[PDB]
Design an enzyme around this catalytic site. Structure first.
Site, PDB file in Angstrom:
ATOM      1  CB  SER A   1       1.366  -2.800  -3.521  1.00 54.73           C
ATOM      2  OG  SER A   1       0.539  -1.634  -3.390  1.00 54.73           O
TER       3      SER A   1
ATOM      4  CE1 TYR B   1       5.429  -1.989  -1.089  1.00 56.47           C
ATOM      5  CE2 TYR B   1       3.407  -1.471   0.048  1.00 56.47           C
ATOM      6  CZ  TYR B   1       4.318  -1.206  -0.930  1.00 56.47           C
ATOM      7  OH  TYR B   1       4.082  -0.148  -1.789  1.00 56.47           O
TER       8      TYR B   1
END
Lengths: 101, 24, 94, 26, 101, 24, 94, 26
Positions: free
Chosen positions: C1, C34
């Site tokens: 991510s 994030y």
């Protein structure tokens, strides 16, 4: 702004009128707008107005919202994530308990 | 101390409609 | 991510699922995403999906998190900073 | 008020990107 | 990140380690970083690292910080603004009460 | 209901130093 | 600054000195600044300084403000929207 | 918690820019 099938909003915990970030996997553009509900089961992801300069029909995007909370709560916080394939088909799971073999 | 956390996301949805003339 | 070695997250006080800003020293790109934890000791800094349009393997980046607090607290606040060199070797000071 | 500030909590300074994948669904 | 003469930080109420937005009047670039204090009276505005891709020596910029507060307080809130000319000379005023004619 | 408000600004300062190799 | 006719600020519930986002429908540029009031009835939407690199006279824009509130409140919240046409003629509905 | 949301407070929809000045110090 960006209209999103209410079923998808439900799964991700995203609210009508909530600030959302949209990250375009296809073209790398990243922008922030707010969410509107589309009809349940429509599987719509619609981009309007200025935002239409940042995404086109067929682009793959990630749509996210963020909340604030105190550090103590944040340490165990769990986001609401929905995964998709094909024509905005939401993946389970949530697998059914095996009752057949 | 207040943290900003990922609330939720729709992962790899496809844009189905786009137009500068849509409202919102 | 942006998956980040848990040891690095610990040193910077960054939480899993916390909003982070990434500033790419190499190409000047700036974006927000994030954090997710990678295995402890992996030394991983991994960008995925859309964010892979903004950074490449070898790029030097700064990863920051921001918190809110009242003014009085803010005036004595000391950020948690980890400095890196080499093979993502972490130090306490620069 | 109270007036609330946004402050640098922490940072990883000059870390090197080790992996980058457009297609990693993760 | 961006180092700023402490005298300028004092006038604008900007804190060391506070999130700041920098809006480059010269080139139109807009970015967000955090403030560090430079020596009082240095008149320094220094940009470091990644941010150096967004501003060059001689560029004219506006540096801003934002705070949150409830709506009732926000209705009468007054920002701290410092104005500059030339070589980062802060303008008064604050005019002296006329005692001479 | 919490508002985000301009706290303060430095209006039209000039950048005096800039370098990719400076720390911070 | 972005100076905005006070009547328009009233209709959208936007405060002087409040952070605003401006989304330029004409050129696709997106930026954030703060609102200052222009004279009531002037119908002014004025961009200054750095922001003048992102919008020009004649451009159609959306000016938005965001607030924070708890989840329960957020779930019944109704934004203050003013719709424009013509010579910045304001309506309540589209 | 309580978990705090960021919500659209209000907007001016499709207003036209009337003035734009790089040099207006204001």
């Amino acid at each position: 702004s960006c209209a999103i099938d209410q079923d998808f909003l439900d799964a991700a915990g995203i609210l009508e009128n909530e600030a959302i970030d949209i990250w375009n996997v296809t073209n790398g553009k990243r922008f922030s707008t707010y969410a509107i509900a589309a009809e349940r089961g429509s599987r719509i992801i619609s981009v309007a107005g200025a935002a239409a300069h940042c995404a086109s029909v067929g682009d793959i995007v990630i749509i996210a919202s963020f909340v604030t909370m105190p550090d103590e709560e944040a340490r165990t916080w769990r986001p609401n994530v929905a995964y998709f394939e094909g024509d905005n088909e939401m993946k389970r799971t949530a697998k059914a308990i095996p009752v057949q073999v | 101390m207040i943290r900003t956390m990922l609330q939720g996301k729709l992962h790899r949805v496809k844009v189905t409609h786009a137009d500068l003339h849509y409202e919102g």
